[PDB]
RNA sequence: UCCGCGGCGCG
DNA sequence: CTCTGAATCTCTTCCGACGCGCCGCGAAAA
């Protein structure tokens, strides 16, 4: 079954793959995060309570005073989002925190408290999230783009051999904590191991090992493997493990237990190892030469004198062996090392480190991390311990701990947030293994090592920083102040935390302006995932390795939406079905497979888990219970493509729409065009401009409904029912009988945004789209927004397009457009700019706005009102005055003779100058609104009273309708009670409402109910009274303007823009284009039926772009309108409903085993009439992205509509009249209009203002500045010669004031002679160098 | 100054005030004869303050303001892209400039560009004032500004008068080569977009994708003479990098020429003998004979003698009537044999170069203009267009893919049996897939290139096919073999970003539906190419700047 | 200010051919240093020259 | 109003 | 066994297109 709104216009589908999981709410990634950031939580793993538990309690370091936290509460915001934006302030809520201060007795224990104080401290403001997922911070609308930062943890990466010669690879291990200093271990080409901190100077590694309570020998025991030697009768014996001889050449004999056998000069083959194993050889005897060159493992001390000989790491020799034998050590311990395994690297590091004990290593690290200051025992110890092994400065967050434990294959999934010594030893071990070859590096950009950090986490971190600031503040307060004559609000200070929050939400790089061109822009901006910002990486250093699409991006980041330009790859997008894991990794859904049969259960998998399994994708075909059709099924095993049996698959792709994001999923026929142009088209859809009228796309992808619904552009009825009142401004709905809250009015009201400025200066308007008495279900769209039709996204318009090189007008991607579309206004748009004028307290009187203005013509004044503000509805041109403001000049004293001369000349010598606001040059339009604001206590003029008065009557009529509804409900209850007993319903209806309230029902329980209803009437009366009076207070009150400003005025200028030659015009699939010709309607080609073609595209784009989607769409569109025409004609023929029901039923039934299966037999005749009314010129088609319409079905649709099957029809030239020799593709294309308006970019400067610093002309159209003749053009002129032109450029047209003045006089006089002169910029340079303390001067003067 | 009497402080002022504070404090401190520790600390503080004043940030942490910005010093104002040298001394912003979006002007000649009327008015306002004073209509410059603002009808006439021969320099940002700035003699058009002659769009490296470009006007007589002599597009038709001509017809014009010269074995009016190209024009414009008809016509050609005299000759020869139409616009010195071929971009380039090397510059300019017009005209009359049915899929494809499927399957089994190694199997799988790709590409080209036709006697014949895509690619007008191969045949065996071939072929074509995994594999190369192309520009510009600054001194 | 970084005595007048104290306001006073205030009367261009 | 810095897109 | 020179290592410096367009916002200084 279908809903009423969908029943209005059902979009026919073609999808063959059955759908399982409905598209989730698109805005989750924002809303869920802020929910985690703002709601109460006792456990409080993450959030504001987590911050408070992480800072409070705070105790005086050696006092008997403590400050402990209880709870936090968020107050109701002063204004709603509409009030906030019209006022132009931050939509914030207060943080109310319950706080307790405790003071103990002096006697032990410390818990012997003696006094407590408790209260709720105000703790600044937090910007609150709006239901549509946006912030309102300064009246403006702002959004946060989530950051894809590198996950905290441990990474093992190689340089691949670029740094050193011979391609020798140098390995690095790096530890990234969630906050605090880093830690890197590196291998030098000399195979020595080094450590470094925060990319400071390199150090020997073991010093950090020595930094802890780890002497040399114990470190050796941890790191290496041991070998035992014994000397008896000048004979050397040692123990053996067969695996040790793997890889060693048999240079000497091997003998044991009277048995000698070895392949002298050869390698120890595995046969030798197995022979030794089966022989179970424990010890062998070796010559002196073998032990020569070996390295000892431990220190050895003789008791003959008390001396230490051959300390550990020292390499054995004949003298050492003689000394140890004569001293008496019969047991020798050494370490074992091979070139293939168990490298000697730690031994070399111990041979190279200058340090010898814990103190010396600590001294070294102090000397390394802070040059220029003296070492010192206590300070060095303190900074080391607080830097690494304390939560004060270091914390590997829980996700960091998880990643760490996973990397070093531990079992525990949770642990401490602070590093431990054994962890460092484990990292050393793993790095040594990697260098040995028994391990693998990890890809730095593997998406399992990137983490999506959302709004809540960033705000939490900033708030934590502010909290530690206020923590030191209160610490020193409690430390200094007396304990029993204060109260926490005295100790606290809201300014630091509020400043931190405001700075993060306003100025941070990841809080950019929220662009509001069209709802698709809304969705794609909120779902954008960036790698820039703090802790990320910068644009100018991002190599190609980060930017490339990794194979793990499947179903997690769309390859298509990513922007072109220097930001490519760094700004990804989130796929439709993906969602964020608890740890912040990316999840995607999958369907479990069993016994070669897929099933409807859904799993969510992260990247790393996905790596293990083997999964097949949606291109695979399923039947019956979902059993695989093909024997060998293609899958995505372990990050690579292959095929397997049915029995080997693990999970199946959730749907065909998995890989694509919203923006690219809106493109039809995506699987037919090259990725470059598909990417450009998906990106360029986002720049569509809402037209005055909207029309549905004939060829859609089925996502438009969902995208419009989730996007906040449209009004959605929160409760179903039947519509009670419809108006262009407001809509009133009556809820159902089963939907009302027990004891509720049952009526809901929405106010529609009529005409307001967008964030990008475009137009935001809403249109009611329901009829009177129309049933409404929940979730139904009740007010179409911009670029929306009946709840369907409609960016552009449908136009009749033909492909042919009609003349030179299509030379490179140049579109030639019929005047017919200009006359129909199919592409007109509306733009709204804003202007402001500010009043500030100037000396000798502040600036004043007034009707009177000197040196201005009478007509201009007549445009202004008596207050000095233009009347609403007055057209204005460029340079006209809008707000008449004057400013005192100051003293401006003049001599009596000069004053008399000024009086003789006229009304001159006045101390007041003009400061009125004018239209920007080239701007024109009509005025739609004037907003005024004024500091409290300053008088409000008649005009401001006027706007406030309209506001108050609007509020009063809203609340009056509210009270009439509530009176209707309450008196309906009164009448029902009367009917239930003591019925006087006829008299009650006849009598006025006072008689309804006054009736006493003989003191029954029904009379008690009547009294309760009278009390309800009373309380609602006072409630409405107080709310209305509060509204009067907030309207009448002053404004919190900027300091020094008494009052401001803002005027809104609206203009209507049309298609103009040179304007840009979009077609999805990356078919860019500039409009290059508007032709009279009689010149364009036409078909045999006389219908002209609106747009003539250049065919030459298609073969080189491989945008073969667009041609397909064109053909498909040709079928769609065809059906429409018949339906249209069949409505004009006014024939029977049943036969048209038959026709439309056939049209829907044409799909070959499509899923929709609509049955019109269930539609009442009114429904069919309405559908046909919408279906006139329509027949929309939905083609899923990779489950789209096969060409055969499009041919069948074409033949149903009686169009020629080939899709190419004959045309006639408008001016010549004979047929074009070959048939020409004619069809229907969805074309968009882009924000790059040609009349905005066109600009011409000539003469104007000059920059004060260097006398050069300004830059920028807004300030009427000239173009820039950059160095490229300088060389261009240099090559041609043309030296005179270059000199003219530099000396007159740019810099030399004297020369350019003389030249201007010459040109006015008609003489065109050059007058060269020294550029003033060079003089500037001369002076600047002369400031450096350098003599520079001209020579031979 | 700022609103309300407030001020914004130039960075130098803060550093100077710091130095003044420290110096005055040190002076008053020395006056009081305090112990050496205080004066030494104060004087070292003054030293660091003046260090910041001169070259803030060179040593230690730069002093910063309340905006946590590193304050600019005197030294920082000279060094860098934003410094005085690069930003100001070179590349001074100029008056009398405008910028606008471009639009194809087909009706233009080679050297005149279309200019929006409003831009012309603004740019030439000094000249409008001058001529208005000359004719005495405006008694004062105030009056001139009035009438020029009042757009009195005389003002437009004066504007046409002044621009009669005054060329304008026209640049497209960014200039990459000396052909990036050219001068045109303007004409006035309505609207707000600069009309450009189609030919020079190749030289400017413009693509008419909403790209903007700027206009300047010379002022001195000298500069106007340099413009007309040196920078005029009619000159400098040969690039300085290499002698190859830069004005080369491409895209629509090439398509029109190729479609015009092509022959068809059977056509209306074929076989008839016609006196001359004039009557060929009569025949075709009367619709009595198709463009591709092969006929016998009389032609005449001329050649320079030892003295350069154009000795004439004439005869009857076979010709397609379209090529006969072409012979009208040829200059008087060209030999006929050049036109007698299936014209393509390479051929047309050789043709224009030929007439440049044989005849003077004016014949070549006129010939280029006329070939431009005629190419557009007959391409228009052609109606050549692309349809969904054009990318015909060869029936052999299913067979070839079947064979390759078997070959890979058996090879995989052989690898599973231990007969071959993973790398060896990888290599031979790549080899067999490449062979399959070659087979299918060859078969598809063979099917596309030729069509079956009927002769005068009804007998089966074969000719070069008239399928739209084939003629688009063959002519060289915005296409090549690779793209048409990808249109309907195999897409190939491209590689992962690491360069390894994925060993799983991209099977379907774009007319067919690329499967999800297939397309997602296909996107890796696209992303890599786009990123590389975007990032290369920085290094290319830098390398150019260094090279220019090394070679700027030389002059013959 | 009297002796600041913009001192009229040092870097010249604040307006073309106008003394700081307004004693002289005619072009005939060119090159005259006002006795009352001590500021040379000349073009404001010297504010770009004098260091 | 003309100043400076950061972010975003276009070519 | 010691001294000097030569060579490497360690640190510091410089610098990665350009033209716009758009947007917003400065202050313990007055
Ligand atoms: Mg371009
Ligand atoms: Zn004076």
UniProtKB/Swiss-Prot annotation, chain A:
Protein family membership: Belongs to the RNA polymerase beta chain family.
Superkingdom of origin: Bacteria
E.C. number: 2.7.7.6
Modified residues (N6-acetyllysine): 1021, 1199
Effect ascribed to mutating residue 664 to E: Resistant to antibiotics salinamide A and B
HAMAP family reported for this sequence: RNApol_bact_RpoB
Reactions accelerated catalytically: RNA(n) + a ribonucleoside 5'-triphosphate = RNA(n+1) + diphosphate
Molecular function via GO: DNA binding; DNA-directed RNA polymerase activity; ribonucleoside binding
Assembly behavior: The RNAP catalytic core consists of 2 alpha, 1 beta, 1 beta' and 1 omega subunit. When a sigma factor is associated with the core the holoenzyme is formed, which can initiate transcription. The rRNA transcription and antitermination complex (rrnTAC) consists of RNAP, NusA, NusB, NusE (rpsJ), NusG, SubB, ribosomal protein S4, DNA and precursor rRNA; S4 is more flexible than other subunits. In pull-down experiments interacts with CedA. (Microbial infection) Interacts (via flap domain) with Escherichia phage lambda antitermination protein Q; this interaction renders bacterial RNAP resistant to transcription pausing and allows it to read through termination signals.
Broad class of enzyme this protein falls into: transferase
Listed GO CC annotations: cytoplasm; cytosol; cytosolic DNA-directed RNA polymerase complex; membrane; transcription elongation factor complex
Pfam family, any one: RNA_pol_Rpb2_1
The species this protein was found in: Escherichia coli (strain K12)
GO BP annotation list: bacterial-type flagellum assembly; bacterial-type flagellum-dependent cell motility; cell motility; cellular response to cell envelope stress; DNA-templated transcription initiation; intracellular iron ion homeostasis; nitrate assimilation; regulation of DNA-templated transcription elongation
UniProt modification remark: Acetylated on several lysine residues in the presence of glucose.
Full protein name: DNA-directed RNA polymerase subunit beta
Function recorded in the entry: DNA-dependent RNA polymerase (RNAP) catalyzes the transcription of DNA into RNA using the four ribonucleoside triphosphates as substrates.
UniProtKB/Swiss-Prot annotation, chain B:
UniProt effect for mutating residue 437 to D: Resistant to antibiotics salinamide A and B
UniProt PTM comment: Acetylated on several lysine residues in the presence of glucose.
Keyword annotations: Acetylation, Antibiotic resistance, DNA-directed RNA polymerase, Magnesium, Metal-binding, Nucleotidyltransferase, Transcription, Transferase, Zinc
Keyword Metal-binding: yes
Effect after changing residue 522 to A: Resistant to antibiotics salinamide A and B
Transmembrane segments: none
Gene Ontology MF: a single term: DNA binding
Domain of life: Bacteria
An annotated GO BP: response to antibiotic
Record family assignment: Belongs to the RNA polymerase beta' chain family.
Name the UniProt record assigns to this protein: DNA-directed RNA polymerase subunit beta'
Record organism: Escherichia coli (strain K12)
Portion of the full-length sequence here: 254 to 809 of 1407
Curated annotation (Swiss-Prot), chain C:
Industrial and biotechnological uses noted in the record: Co-administration of salinamide and rifampicin or salinamide and myxopyronin suppresses the emergence of resistance to both antibiotics.
Post-translational modification: Acetylated on several lysine residues in the presence of glucose.
Residues reported in the UniProt entry to bind Zn(2+) 1: 19, 21, 34, 37
Chain's role: DNA-dependent RNA polymerase (RNAP) catalyzes the transcription of DNA into RNA using the four ribonucleoside triphosphates as substrates. Resistance to the antibiotics salinamide A, salinamide B, rifampicin, streptolydigin, CBR703, myxopyronin, and lipiarmycin can result from mutations in this protein.
Subunit structure: The RNAP catalytic core consists of 2 alpha, 1 beta, 1 beta' and 1 omega subunit. When a sigma factor is associated with the core the holoenzyme is formed, which can initiate transcription. The rRNA transcription and antitermination complex (rrnTAC) consists of RNAP, NusA, NusB, NusE (rpsJ), NusG, SubB, ribosomal protein S4, DNA and precursor rRNA; S4 is more flexible than other subunits.
Family the entry assigns: Belongs to the RNA polymerase beta' chain family.
Descriptive protein name: DNA-directed RNA polymerase subunit beta'
Biological source species: Escherichia coli (strain K12)
Gene that encodes it: rpoC
């Amino acid at each position: 079954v279908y809903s009423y709104t969908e029943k209005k216009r059902i979009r026919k589908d073609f999808g063959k793959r059955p759908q399982v999981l409905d598209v989730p709410y698109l805005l989750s990634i924002q809303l869920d995060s802020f929910q985690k950031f703002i709601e109460q939580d006792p456990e409080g793993q993450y959030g504001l309570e987590a911050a408070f538990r992480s800072v409070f309690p705070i105790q005086s370091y050696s006092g008997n005073s403590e400050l402990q936290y209880v709870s936090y509460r968020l107050g109701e915001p002063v204004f709603d989002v509409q009030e906030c934006q019209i006022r132009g302030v931050t939509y914030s809520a207060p943080l109310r925190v319950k706080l307790r201060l405790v003071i103990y007795e002096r006697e032990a224990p410390e818990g012997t408290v003696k006094d407590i104080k408790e209260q709720e401290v105000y703790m600044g403001e937090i910007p609150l999230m709006t239901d549509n997922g946006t912030f309102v911070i300064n009246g403006t609308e702002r959004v946060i783009v989530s950051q894809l930062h590198r996950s905290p943890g441990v990474f093992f990466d190689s340089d691949k051999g670029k740094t050193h010669s011979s391609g020798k690879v140098l390995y690095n291990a790096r530890i990234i904590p969630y906050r605090g200093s880093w830690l890197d271990f590196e291998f030098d080409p000399k195979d020595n191991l080094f450590v470094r901190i925060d990319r400071r100077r390199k150090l020997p590694a073991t010093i950090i090992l020595r930094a802890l309570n780890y002497t040399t020998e114990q470190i050796l025991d941890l790191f290496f493997e041991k070998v035992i030697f014994e000397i008896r009768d000048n004979k050397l014996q040692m123990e053996l493990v067969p695996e040790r001889l793997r890889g060693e050449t048999a240079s000497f004999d091997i003998e044991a237990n009277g048995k000698v056998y070895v392949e002298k000069g050869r390698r120890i083959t595995a046969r030798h190892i197995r022979q030794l194993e089966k022989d179970d050889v424990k010890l062998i005897e070796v010559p002196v030469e073998y032990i020569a060159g070996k390295v000892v493992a431990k220190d050895y001390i003789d008791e003959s004198t008390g001396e230490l000989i051959c300390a550990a790491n020292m390499e054995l020799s004949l003298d050492l062996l003689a000394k140890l034998s004569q001293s008496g050590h019969k047991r020798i311990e050494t370490l074992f090392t091979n070139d293939l395994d168990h490298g000697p690297y730690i031994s070399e590091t111990l041979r190279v480190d200058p340090t010898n004990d814990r103190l010396s290593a600590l001294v070294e690290i102090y000397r390394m991390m802070r040059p220029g200051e003296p070492p010192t025992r206590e300070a060095a110890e303190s900074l080391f311990e607080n830097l690494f092994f304390s939560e004060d400065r270091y914390d590997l967050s829980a996700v960091g701990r998880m990643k760490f434990n996973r990397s070093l294959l531990r079992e525990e999934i949770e642990g401490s947030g602070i590093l431990s010594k054994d962890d460092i030893i484990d990292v050393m071990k793993k790095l040594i293994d990697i260098r040995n070859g028994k391990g693998e590096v990890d890809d730095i950009d593997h998406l399992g090592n990137r983490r999506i950090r959302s709004v809540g986490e960033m705000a939490e971190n900033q708030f934590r920083v502010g909290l530690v600031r206020v923590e030191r503040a209160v610490k020193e307060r409690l430390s200094l102040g007396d304990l029993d004559t204060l109260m926490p609000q005295d100790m606290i200070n809201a300014k630091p935390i509020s400043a931190a929050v405001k700075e993060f939400f306003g100025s941070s790089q990841l809080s950019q302006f929220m662009d509001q061109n069209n709802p698709l822009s809304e969705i794609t901006h909120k779902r954008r995932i960036s790698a820039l910002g703090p802790g990320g990486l910068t644009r100018e250093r991002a190599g190609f390795e980060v930017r490339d699409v990794h194979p793990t991006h499947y179903g997690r980041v769309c390859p298509i939406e990513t922007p072109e330009g220097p930001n490519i790859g760094l700004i990804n997008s989130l796929s439709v079905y993906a969602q964020t894991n608890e740890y912040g990794f990316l999840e995607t859904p999958y369907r479990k497979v069993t016994d070669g049969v897929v099933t409807d259960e859904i799993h969510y998998l992260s990247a790393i888990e996905e790596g293990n399994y083997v999964i097949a994708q949606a291109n695979s075909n399923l039947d019956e219970e979902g059993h695989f059709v093909e024997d060998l099924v293609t899958c995505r095993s372990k990050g690579e493509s292959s095929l397997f049996s049915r029995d080997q698959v693990d999970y199946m792709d959730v749907s065909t729409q998995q890989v694509v994001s919203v923006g690219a999923s809106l493109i039809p026929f995506l699987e037919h065009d090259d990725a470059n142009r598909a990417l450009m088209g998906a990106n360029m859809q986002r720049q569509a401009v809402p037209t005055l009228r909207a029309d549905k796309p004939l060829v859609g992808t089925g996502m438009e409904r969902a995208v419009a619904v989730d996007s906040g552009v449209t009004a959605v009825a929160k409760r179903g029912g039947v519509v009670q009142y419809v108006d262009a401004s407001r809509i009133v709905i009556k809820v159902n009988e089963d939907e009302m809250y027990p004891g509720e009015a049952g009526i809901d009201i929405y106010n529609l945004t009529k005409y307001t400025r967008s964030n990008q200066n475009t137009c935001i308007n809403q249109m009611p789209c329901v009829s009177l008495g129309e049933p409404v279900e929940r979730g139904d769209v009740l007010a179409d927004g911009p670029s929306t039709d009946l709840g369907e996204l409609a960016l552009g318009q449908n136009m009749r397009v033909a492909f042919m090189p009609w003349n030179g007008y299509n030379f490179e991607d140049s579109i030639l457009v019929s005047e017919r579309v200009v006359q129909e206004d199919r592409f007109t748009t509306i733009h709204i700019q804003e202007l402001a004028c500010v009043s500030r307290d100037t000396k000798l009187g502040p600036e004043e706005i007034t009707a009177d203005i000197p040196n201005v013509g009478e007509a201009a004044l007549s445009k202004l009102d008596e207050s000095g503000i233009v009347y609403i509805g007055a057209e204005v041109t460029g340079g006209d005055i809008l707000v008449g403001k004057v400013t005192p000049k100051g003293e401006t004293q003049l001599t009596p003779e000069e004053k008399l001369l000024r009086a003789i000349f006229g009304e001159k010598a006045s101390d007041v100058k003009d400061s009125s606001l004018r239209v920007p040059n080239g701007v024109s339009g009509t005025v739609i609104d004037v907003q005024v604001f004024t500091r409290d206590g300053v008088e409000k003029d008649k005009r401001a009273l006027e706007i406030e008065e309209m506001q108050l009557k609007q509020a009063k009529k809203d609340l009056s309708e509210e009270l009439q509804i509530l009176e209707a409900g309450l008196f309906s209850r009164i009448r029902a009670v009367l009917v239930a007993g003591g019925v006087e319903a006829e008299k009650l209806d006849k009598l006025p409402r006072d008689r309804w309230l006054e009736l006493g029902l003989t003191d029954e329980e029904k009379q008690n109910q009547l009294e309760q209803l009278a009390e309800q009437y009373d309380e609602l009366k006072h409630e409405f009274e107080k709310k209305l009076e509060a509204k009067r207070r907030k309207i009448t009150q002053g404004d919190d303007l900027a300091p020094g400003v008494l009052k401001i005025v803002k005027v809104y200028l609206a203009v209507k823009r049309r298609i103009q030659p040179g304007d840009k015009m979009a077609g999805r699939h990356g078919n860019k284009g500039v409009i290059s010709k508007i032709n009279p309607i009689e010149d364009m080609p036409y078909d045999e039926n006389g219908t002209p073609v609106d747009i003539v595209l250049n065919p030459l784009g298609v073969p080189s772009r491989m945008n073969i989607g667009q041609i397909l769409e064109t053909h498909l569109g040709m079928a769609a309108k065809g059906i429409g025409d018949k339906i249209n004609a069949m409505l004009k023929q006014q024939q029977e409903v049943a036969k048209l029901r038959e026709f439309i039923q056939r049209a829907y039934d044409l799909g070959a085993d499509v899923r929709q299966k609509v049955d019109l037999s269930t539609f009442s005749d009114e429904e069919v009439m309405r559908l046909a009314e919408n279906l006139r010129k329509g027949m929309p088609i939905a083609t899923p992205v990779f489950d789209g319409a096969k060409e055969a079905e499009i041919k069948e649709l074409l033949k149903l509509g009686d169009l020629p099957t080939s899709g190419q029809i004959r045309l006639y030239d408008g001016r010549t009249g004979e047929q074009f020799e070959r048939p020409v593709t004619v069809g229907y294309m969805y074309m968009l209009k882009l924000n790059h308006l040609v009349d905005d970019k066109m600009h011409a400067r000539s003469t104007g203002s000059y920059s004060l610093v260097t006398q050069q002309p300004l830059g920028g159209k807004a300030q009427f500045g000239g173009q820039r003749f950059g160095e490229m053009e300088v060389w261009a002129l240099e090559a041609y010669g043309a030296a005179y032109t270059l000199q003219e450029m530099l000396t007159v047209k740019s810099d030399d004031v004297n020369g350019r003045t003389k030249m201007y006089k010459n040109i006015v006089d008609g003489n065109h002679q050059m007058e060269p002169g020294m550029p003033e910029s060079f003089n500037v340079l001369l002076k600047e160098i002369r400031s450096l303390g350098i003599n520079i001067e001209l020579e031979d003067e | 100054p700022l609103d309300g009497g407030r001020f914004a402080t130039s960075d130098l002022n803060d550093l100077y005030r710091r130095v003044i504070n420290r110096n005055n404090r040190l002076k008053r401190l020395l006056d009081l004869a305090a112990p050496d520790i205080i004066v030494r600390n104060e004087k070292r503080m003054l030293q660091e303050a003046v260090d910041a004043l001169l070259d803030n940030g060179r040593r230690g942490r730069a002093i910063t303001g309340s905006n946590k910005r590193p304050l600019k010093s005197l030294a920082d104002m000279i060094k860098g892209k934003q410094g005085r040298f690069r930003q100001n001394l070179l590349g001074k912003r100029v008056d009398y400039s405008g910028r606008s979006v471009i639009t194809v002007g087909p009706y233009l000649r080679l050297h005149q560009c279309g200019l929006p009327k409003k831009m012309a008015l603004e740019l030439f306002k000094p000249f409008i004032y001058g001529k208005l004073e000359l004719r005495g209509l405006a008694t004062t410059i105030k009056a001139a500004k009035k009438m020029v603002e009042r757009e009195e009808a005389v003002v437009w006439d004066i504007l046409d008068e002044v621009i009669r021969e005054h060329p304008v320099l026209l640049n497209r940002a960014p200039t990459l080569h000396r052909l990036g700035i050219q001068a045109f003699e303007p004409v006035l058009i309505e609207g707000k977009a600069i009309q450009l002659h189609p030919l020079v769009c190749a030289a400017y490296n413009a693509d008419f994708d909403g790209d903007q470009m700027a206009v300047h006007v010379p002022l001195t007589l000298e500069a106007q003479l340099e413009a007309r002599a040196l920078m005029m597009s009619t000159n400098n038709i040969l690039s300085p990098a290499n002698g190859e001509p830069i004005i080369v017809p491409s895209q629509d014009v090439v398509l029109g020429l190729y479609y015009m010269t092509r022959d068809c074995v059977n056509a209306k009016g074929e076989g008839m003998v016609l006196t001359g190209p004039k009557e060929a024009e009569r025949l075709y414009r009367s619709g009595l004979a198709s463009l591709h008809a092969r006929v016998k016509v009389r032609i005449t050609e001329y050649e320079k003698d030892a003295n350069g005299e154009l000795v004439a000759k004439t005869s009857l020869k076979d010709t397609t009537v379209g090529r006969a139409i072409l012979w009208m616009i040829v200059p008087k010195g060209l030999p006929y044999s050049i036109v007698n071929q299936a014209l393509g971009k390479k051929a047309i380039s050789k043709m224009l170069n030929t007439c440049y090397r044989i005849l003077g510059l004016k014949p070549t300019v006129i010939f280029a203009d006329q070939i431009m017009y005629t190419g557009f005209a007959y391409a228009a009359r052609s109606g050549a267009s692309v349809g969904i049915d054009d990318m015909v899929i060869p029936e052999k494809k299913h067979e070839i893919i079947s064979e390759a499927e078997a070959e890979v399957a058996e090879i995989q089994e052989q690898f599973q049996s231990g007969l071959v190694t993973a790398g060896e199997r990888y290599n031979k799988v790549i080899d067999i897939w490449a062979a399959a790709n070659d087979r299918v590409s060859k078969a598809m080209m063979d099917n596309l290139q030729t069509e079956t036709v009927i002769n005068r006697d009804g007998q089966e014949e074969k000719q070069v096919s008239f399928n739209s895509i084939y003629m688009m690619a063959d002519s060289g007008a915005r296409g090549s073999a690779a793209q048409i191969r990808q249109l309907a045949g195999m897409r190939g065996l491209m590689a992962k970003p690491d360069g390894s071939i994925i060993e799983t072929p991209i099977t379907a074509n774009f007319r067919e539906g690329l499967n999800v995994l297939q397309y997602f594999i296909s996107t890796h190369g696209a992303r890599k190419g786009l990123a590389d192309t975007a990032l290369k520009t920085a290094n290319s510009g830098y390398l150019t700047r260094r090279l220019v600054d090394v070679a700027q001194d030389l002059v013959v | 200010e009297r002796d600041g970084l913009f001192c009229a005595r040092i870097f010249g007048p604040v307006k073309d051919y106008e003394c700081l104290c307004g004693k002289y306001k005619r072009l005939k006073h060119r090159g005259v240093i006002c006795e009352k205030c001590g500021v040379e009367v000349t073009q404001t261009k010297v504010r770009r020259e004098r260091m």
